[PDB]
Design a protein around this ligand. Structure first.
Ligand SMILES: [Zn+2]
Ligand SMILES: [Zn+2]
Ligand SMILES: [Zn+2]
Lengths: 89, 513
């Protein structure tokens, strides 16, 4: 051949049990509102209800995890105390 | 000459009242001597022209500044009359410098000029005013006055620190590097809107760590130590996470090299360098591009995904193209090219069959839009006499039916020639600026709504505007208070279970935890 690849350096991202189809706290979907909301409108304004991303790389609706934090504060899908980094999908 | 002659007059009056008269009578007169005499014309003097304060500031005769400082120290309100004029001059120079008119202010040069004028002002202050408190607070307020404008300044300073950290070519030794870094963080000290600063600093970290390594390998510790004294430890969760992700990436790289030396039956697993990090830390570039990949990178990505889904039970993988690089071994000698995960698919399609066009690479590739355009242009457009992908229809704009060819270009005096069309002159186009502004706006929104739920659970309640003062004081060193935004967002806690904060019954608030 005329051009042959010798070296490659991809960077491979990884996702834990974020479940990009079912929030693990309320069980609705990674997006599509939460249980305390449901209605896409209803005094929401640009639906103030987005996805929250932990350091443990799990994902839930901000509302669900922030309401769950009131009581239990250690991420239900492992044991890690749970921190924050990215908001939204 | 007026200051010198009035000083001579003061001295001769002092010696006269010390001999011919009695020193006791000097005080009332020296009052008028600084009042009905100095104060009188001091006005005309603390302004006007004829080699005046505003002219000696731009000329730089420090002896005159020191002389007038030691002279006007006796007359009351004289320090104020000179502070107001020097502040007017500094505000003029500032609005002449922050001039946004004529978009094109060179980033590393605008902030350099800002440092140049604040340093000369501070040195004139320390040599003449002897570190006076009044002049210091006046220049502080002056700096706070014009720094509310020019919102690209944190981005300009972040681009400056990236240019200084990528390679220490200028100032090979460590002493001047240390001094320039201290001056940089001092300049950053008198800067607001730290959120965009941290965002762009993290973006520059991602740009400098996901590229060719061995930039400094030691200055990162100095940077993180300086940031612990500057930004604090609230942004080191994602900072140390970037470092830990780089560490895990190289560890998994050597581990996958070992596991490939064991298996690696396919030729796809040759010289492989696969890094591993998590979404939270490094933001998603786009919608995980899924364009056709060359058979070798396909096999490499398949092996990496199988490993990440097997050993890491629960974790998986997400293929993408908007990151990384490669070394394309071309072949009179064998010169190895370089492709940054963008030209691999097009060059592989050319290897499979040459004489393609835009339709061929847009039909049988599943190629995206903006980034495809970018790569194609970088490869056949705006190229110096090192063209690796030529075409017959020579033109600036991109057509559809244009055949692509290849040229030798023996000007490469080595075997490792790279095409670094990416990371060009800092343009900062409107779409990327708007999207990062929206991102930092959503970040600010989440930040204020995360600080309020952390604080007001252990504090008292507000009636109308009591706790907003506290939530703005806690964020004074972060960014602007944005009263309208926070007022519109706090009324969104009614839908939240924690502290509905009843608007009509604002007499008593809840504390459900
Ligand atoms: Zn949920
Ligand atoms: Zn919700
Ligand atoms: Zn977790």
């Amino acid at each position: 051949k005329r051009f042959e690849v010798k070296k490659w350096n991809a960077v491979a991202l990884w996702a834990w049990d974020i479940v990009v189809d079912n929030c693990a706290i309320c069980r609705n979907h990674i997006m599509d509102l939460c249980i305390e909301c449901q209605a896409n409108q209803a005094s929401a304004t640009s639906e103030e209800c987005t996805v929250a991303w932990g350091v443990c790389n799990h994902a839930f609706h901000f509302h669900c995890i922030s309401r769950w934090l009131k009581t239990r504060q250690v991420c239900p899908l492992d044991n890690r105390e749970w921190e924050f980094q990215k908001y939204g999908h | 000459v007026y200051i010198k002659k009035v000083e001579a007059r003061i001295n001769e009056e002092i010696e006269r009242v010390m001999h011919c008269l009695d020193k006791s009578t000097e005080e009332p007169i020296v009052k008028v001597v600084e009042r009905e005499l100095i104060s009188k014309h001091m006005k005309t003097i603390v302004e006007m022209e004829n080699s005046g304060l505003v002219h000696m500031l731009k000329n730089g005769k420090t002896e005159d500044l020191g002389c007038m400082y030691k002279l006007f120290s006796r007359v009351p309100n004289g320090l104020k009359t000179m502070c107001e004029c020097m502040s007017s001059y500094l505000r003029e120079q500032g609005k002449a410098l922050v001039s946004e008119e004529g978009e094109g202010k060179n980033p590393v040069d605008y902030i350099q000029g800002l440092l140049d004028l604040k340093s000369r002002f501070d040195r004139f202050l320390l040599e003449s005013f002897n570190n006076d408190r009044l002049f210091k607070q006046t220049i502080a307020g002056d700096f706070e006055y014009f720094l509310n404008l020019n919102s690209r300044s944190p981005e300009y300073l972040s681009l400056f620190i990236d240019d200084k950290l990528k390679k220490g070519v200028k100032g090979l030794t460590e002493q001047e590097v240390e001094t320039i870094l201290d001056k940089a963080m001092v300049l950053f000290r008198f800067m607001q809107e730290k959120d965009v600063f941290e965002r762009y600093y993290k973006q520059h970290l991602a740009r400098r760590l996901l590229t060719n390594k061995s930039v400094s390998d030691d200055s990162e510790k100095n940077m993180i130590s300086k940031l612990k004294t500057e930004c604090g430890c609230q942004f080191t969760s994602k900072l140390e996470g970037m470092f830990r992700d780089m560490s895990i990436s190289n560890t998994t790289m050597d581990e996958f090299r070992q596991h490939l030396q064991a298996t690696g039956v396919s030729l796809g697993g040759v010289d492989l360098t696969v890094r591993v990090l998590t979404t939270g830390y490094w933001p998603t570039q786009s919608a995980t591009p899924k364009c056709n990949i060359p058979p070798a990178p396909r096999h490499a990505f398949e092996i990496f995904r199988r490993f990440y889904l097997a050993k890491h039970s629960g974790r998986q993988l997400t293929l993408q193209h908007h990151m990384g690089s490669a070394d394309l071994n071309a072949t009179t000698r064998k010169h190895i090219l370089q492709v940054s995960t963008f030209q691999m698919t097009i060059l592989m399609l050319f290897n499979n069959r040459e004489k393609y066009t835009f339709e061929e690479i847009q039909q049988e590739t599943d190629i995206p839009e903006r980034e495809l355009v970018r790569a194609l242009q970088s490869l056949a457009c705006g190229k110096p006499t090192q063209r690796v992908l030529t075409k017959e229809p020579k033109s600036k704009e991109i057509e559809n039916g244009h055949i692509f060819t290849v040229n030798d270009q023996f000007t490469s005096k080595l075997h490792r020639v790279k095409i670094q069309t990416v990371a060009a002159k800092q343009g900062e186009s409107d779409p990327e600026r708007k999207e990062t502004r929206q991102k930092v706006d959503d970040d600010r929104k989440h930040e204020i709504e995360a600080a309020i739920v952390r604080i007001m659970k252990s504090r008292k309640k507000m009636q109308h505007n009591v706790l907003v003062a506290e939530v703005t004081q806690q964020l004074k060193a972060r960014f602007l208070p944005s009263p309208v935004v926070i007022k519109k967002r706090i009324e969104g806690l009614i839908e939240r279970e924690y502290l509905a904060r009843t608007p009509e019954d604002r007499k008593v608030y809840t504390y459900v935890a």
